Design a protein around this ligand. Structure first.
Ligand code: NAG
Ligand code: NAG
Ligand code: NAG
Ligand code: CA
Ligand code: CA
Ligand code: CA
Ligand code: CA
Ligand code: CA
Ligand code: MG
Lengths: 579, 455
């Protein structure tokens, strides 16, 4: 109720697009603004300083690539100040298909400092024609029965993939390397039993680096039957760590799976020594088998996994993200024919874990799960992740996931269904810890397109009970804007009126020129009625979409007053809480 | 039954002070030590003070109607609203002879509609025949849609922008958002020739952009060529639909602006604006009086039936896998739309509350509802809606309209406050207040000049 509209400040670069202000974030050292590009323009991230009053675009130092999407997805970690930014517009073609996924960036210090990058849920292109090389271990450690089952594995893979466009080659490696048959040899016979008839166990060391280089330079050759327009694939089978060192830069263009088998890969430290030989992410290209017998189980993953139906080709990863306590998650709405899901990210961004609906039914498809992803952390109770599928059954729903506990796995603990078609229920989420006790007891769900009773958009308050989240109340915006999109932006604001209770802002960007509502924290929950309604008209005469984005966790200049940044069309605005 | 006073100094200030306040208009009603505040109180309290029933001023809400071809009557109503007291009047609905019908056929042209397209191309005469079997002087139009032409709604690979259909198919056109094909006409041969030119198409993701096309149909009445008659918009599809928010996947962040963007009969700028919201389309359709008929296949029926909650004048019918039953669908949908009658009003200030009582001919009655609703309405069999209007303040002169949804006929409701006692003629009491001041409501309001009380 104490936000000073008469002192509001405006920030806008002279060439800001209309979507400058699509995302705003107060970080330690200023305010970040996401500015997706319109039309042909690429997107960008801006750095805005309160003392300067200017907004300057940021240059990313290691990004080969920038699409119009950049600026669409911004998150910050309250514990350590990290910044997560994603570009969900990494487009690429594979034969006549086009793939679309994201490119995510992690800034430990600030936008100007060191940056990590990765490609979550990135499905590599594998064309219709595939030249695949089996690079199989023949080291001193293998028993004759174990060597045979590696050979049986290669034969069974070729048996399943006979009568495809696949062409095959095989190289044994130990101390040295020997091509057991070339691509042209496979073309001549197509008989796995005859092609591997002369194989003799080398029974020496394990020189994986030299072997992989030998494949890239001595095996993938046109005069040996290799097709220059085929996708190069390499399957590496080993039962121990490499006895050499170096680099496999020569084989970087080759898609590399590696299969680690047996007792020598018992500790996960030794399993990670295989990651440098395989493609990314390791969760897809590194298979650890505890026994050679599980090689027969593998034909489902290394044959069926190598368009009317889509898995991750159009995942649209990075379309939403959150970052809390060093843990990053990005949504992937296109996953599984737009059924959706999210990607649990390893914090160097080089590996990921997909989590979606289960079971996959016809009903969840085109639901856009992962359109929002919001951590609901707790110190004593289990920590959860809320993710919206605002298109589920054309109505929308929210799934609640529980963090892996102990040795176990991600678990889905609750589903919350919307009731109105087109309402985009679950299109905006927000966790609130009112008393700042470390337990996130409230989940706010926005339904910004909700229609009826002379007010557009809804925000529902859910509170965590023993069995799950129970709907306790609703944040009540004004009537009079049936299309106003109340709830397009929801955020916890820390304490702006000094009573120790977190407060919440809700943005309604299409209520005339846009508006922001303040709901104060009380003992037991949130006040359903707002204590303040800031009209965009009052902030700027010609403003539009005021309230499209809100972030107010910070005191930007250290004067004792809370600051709240608000996005609008081509604008970012800073409001200060005043006594 | 209750009258909190603050500083009443005349009759109007008394009535305005509260719904239960009344005023005594008797001469010499006040004692010298007592102010003129005591003329204002509840009715029993004023009677206790000796005021005769005929001197108690208690304005009550009132409804006056001017009637003047019987579908919606009356056409003009005047309301005098005492705060807290509702005024009632009945609107009579007499379903008239059906008007001519403009039917715009908006068809999905995704590849699974290939056999549907082969049938619809030959149904121009069957459609006009059906319209002239319901009423007379029918017209038909045609448009087509697929989706927005950006990733991931279509595959933007140049080979697939050229042939979105399967590679074997080669009577296929590039994907497109909306194409207006045929302006409304009674010439079935124009339909046959113009719809005959249309080729099947394709796209990438299952939901489609038909809501975009519906918005353009509603925003471009001159290009569509609507008459001022019954406007039916058939929406034939075998899939779900995108709506606002979905554009983010293709980096489309600008809301649908509800404007007409037809250039060369194509929604060219469709990749610039996000899909509309359902409520936004429901609003555009009600403005232009366009009633949609969702002709969808079996697995989509229950999904599209939920739209009838947001779009009051819409209907859903199950469409065949080859669209061969679409004519009966339209006939059944017209009966569904015309046997259901909603009575509703336009936007109101927060000072007015309107509620409806529905006295339907099919034996159903609803009381005190936000909207009039009757089903099974039959030609020339009248139904009644009782409208109750309540004001919370003493309001400024104002008006709103009442429609039977789906028709342009209105009831213009003129709303006036009633904060004025209409008091007795000062005749027979002239000689007045022993001064020049004039009387209003038995209390002397003296001409300024010395002023005071008794004058
Ligand atoms: C960009 O390309 C360079 C190759 O020069 C590579 O080092 C870098 O990892 C690439 N970045 C991404 C995100 O792939
Ligand atoms: C119509 O309104 C009148 C008052 O004008 C009332 O007597 C009557 O009850 C209403 N109609 C019905 C069916 O009750
Ligand atoms: C068809 O309708 C048009 C209205 O544009 C009218 O000019 C024409 O005379 C009609 N033709 C027939 C045969 O009814
Ligand atoms: Ca708490
Ligand atoms: Ca507070
Ligand atoms: Ca400050
Ligand atoms: Ca069909
Ligand atoms: Ca589509
Ligand atoms: Mg070994």
């Amino acid at each position: 109720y104490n936000l000073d509209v008469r002192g509001a400040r405006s920030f806008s670069p002279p060439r800001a697009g209309r979507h400058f202000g699509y995302r705003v974030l107060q970080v330690g050292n200023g305010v970040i603004v996401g500015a997706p590009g319109e039309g042909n323009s690429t997107g960008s991230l801006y750095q805005c300083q309160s003392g300067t009053g200017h907004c300057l675009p940021v240059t990313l130092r290691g990004s080969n690539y920038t699409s119009k999407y950049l600026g669409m997805t911004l998150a910050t970690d309250p514990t350590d100040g990290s910044i997560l930014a994603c570009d969900p517009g990494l487009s690429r073609t594979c034969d006549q298909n086009t793939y679309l996924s994201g490119l995510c960036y992690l800034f430990r210090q600030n936008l100007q400092g060191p940056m990590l990058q990765g490609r979550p849920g990135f499905q590599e292109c594998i064309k219709g024609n595939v030249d695949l090389v089996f690079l199989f271990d023949g080291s001193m450690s293998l028993q004759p029965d174990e060597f045979q089952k590696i050979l049986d594995f290669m034969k069974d893979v070729m048996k399943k993939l006979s009568n495809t466009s696949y062409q095959f080659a095989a190289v044994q490696f130990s101390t040295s390397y020997k091509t057991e048959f070339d691509f042209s040899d496979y073309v001549k016979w197509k008989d796995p039993d005859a092609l591997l008839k002369h194989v003799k166990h080398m029974l020496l060391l394990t020189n994986t680096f030299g072997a992989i280089n030998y494949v890239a330079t001595e095996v993938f050759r046109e005069e040996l039957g290799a097709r220059p327009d085929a996708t190069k694939v390499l399957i590496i089978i080993t039962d121990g760590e490499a006895t050499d060192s170096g680099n496999i830069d020569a084989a970087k263009d080759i898609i590399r799976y590696i299969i680690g088998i047996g007792k020598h890969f018992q500790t996960k430290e030794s399993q990670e020594t295989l990651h440098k030989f395989a493609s990314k992410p390791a969760s897809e290209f590194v298979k650890i088998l505890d026994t050679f017998e599980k090689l027969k189980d593998l034909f489902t993953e290394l044959q069926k996994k190598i368009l009317t139906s889509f898995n991750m080709e159009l995942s649209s990863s990075g379309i939403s993200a959150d970052l809390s306590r060093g843990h990053a998650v990005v949504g992937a709405v296109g996953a599984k024919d737009w059924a959706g899901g999210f990607l649990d990210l390893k914090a160097d961004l080089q590996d990921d874990t997909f989590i979606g609906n289960e079971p996959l039914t016809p009903e969840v498809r085109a639901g856009y799960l992962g359109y929002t992803v919001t951590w609901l952390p707790s110190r004593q109770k289990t920590s959860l992740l809320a993710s919206g599928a605002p298109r589920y059954q054309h109505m929308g729903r929210v799934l609640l996931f529980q963090e892996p506990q102990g040795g176990g796995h991600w678990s889905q603990v609750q589903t919350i269904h919307g009731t109105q078609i087109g309402s985009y229920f679950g299109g905006e989420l927000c966790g609130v810890d009112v008393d700042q006790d470390g337990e996130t007891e409230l989940l706010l769900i926005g339904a910004p397109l909700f229609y009826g009773e002379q007010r557009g958009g809804r925000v529902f308050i859910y509170q965590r009970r023993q069995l799950g989240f129970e709907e306790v109340s609703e944040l009540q915006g004004d009537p009079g804007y049936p299309l106003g999109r109340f709830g397009e932006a929801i955020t916890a604001l820390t304490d702006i009126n000094g009573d120790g209770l977190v407060d919440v802002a809700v943005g309604a960007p299409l209520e005339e020129q846009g508006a922001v509502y303040i709901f104060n924290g009380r003992h037991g929950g949130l006040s359903p009625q707002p204590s303040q309604r800031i009209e965009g008209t009052q902030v700027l005469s010609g403003i539009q979409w005021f309230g499209r984005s809100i972030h107010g966790v910070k005191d930007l200049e250290g004067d004792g007053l809370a600051d709240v940044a608000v996005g609008a069309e081509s604008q970012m605005i800073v409001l200060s809480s005043r006594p | 039954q209750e009258c909190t006073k603050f500083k009443v100094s005349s009759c109007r200030e008394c009535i305005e002070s509260g719904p239960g306040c009344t005023w005594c208009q008797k001469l010499n009603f006040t004692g010298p030590g007592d102010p003129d505040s005591i003329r204002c109180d509840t009715r029993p309290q004023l009677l206790m003070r000796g005021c005769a029933a005929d001197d108690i001023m208690d304005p009550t809400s009132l409804a006056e109607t001017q009637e003047d071809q019987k579908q919606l009557s009356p056409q003009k109503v005047t309301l005098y609203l005492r705060p807290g007291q509702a005024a009632a009047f009945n609107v009579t609905f007499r379903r008239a002879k059906g008007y001519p019908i403009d039917l715009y056929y908006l068809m999905d042209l995704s590849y699974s509609m290939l056999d549907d397209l082969r049938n619809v191309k030959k149904l121009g005469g069957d459609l006009l025949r059906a319209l002239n079997e319901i009423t007379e002087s029918g017209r038909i139009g045609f448009g087509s849609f697929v989706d927005k032409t950006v990733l991931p709604f279509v595959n933007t690979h140049p080979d697939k922008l050229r042939n979105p259909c399967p590679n074997k198919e080669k009577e296929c056109q590039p994907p497109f958002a909306f194409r207006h094909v045929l302006k409304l006409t009674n010439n079935s041969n124009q339909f046959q020739t113009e719809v005959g030119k249309q080729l099947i198409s394709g796209n990438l993701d299952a939901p489609e952009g038909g809501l975009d096309a519906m918005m353009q149909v509603a925003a471009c009445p001159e290009e569509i060529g609507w008459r001022k008659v019954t406007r039916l918009l058939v929406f034939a599809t075998d899939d779900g639909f995108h709506f606002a928010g979905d554009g983010k996947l293709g980096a489309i962040l600008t809301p649908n602006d509800g404007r007409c963007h037809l250039e060369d009969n194509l929604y060219k700028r469709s990749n610039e604006f996000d899909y509309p919201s359902v409520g936004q389309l429901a609003h555009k359709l009600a403005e232009n009086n366009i009633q949609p008929i969702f002709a969808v296949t079996s697995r989509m029926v229950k999904t599209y039936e939920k739209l009838t909650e947001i779009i009051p004048k819409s209907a859903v019918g199950e469409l065949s896998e080859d669209s061969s039953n679409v004519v009966q669908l339209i006939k059944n949908a017209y009966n569904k739309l015309s046997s259901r009658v909603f009575l509703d009003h336009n936007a109101l200030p927060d000072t007015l509350k309107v509620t409806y009582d529905s006295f339907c001919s099919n034996g159903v009655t609803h009381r005190n509802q936000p909207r009039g609703d009757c089903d099974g309405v039959q030609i020339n069999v009248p139904i009644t809606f009782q409208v109750k209007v309540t004001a919370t303040e003493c309001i400024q002169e104002q008006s709103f309209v009442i429609r039977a949804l789906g028709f342009t006929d209105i009831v213009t409701v003129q709303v006036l406050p009633q904060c004025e006692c209409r008091c007795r003629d000062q005749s027979r009491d002239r000689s007045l207040c022993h001064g020049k001041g004039f009387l209003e409501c038995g209390i002397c309001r003296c001409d300024t000049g010395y002023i005071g009380k008794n004058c």
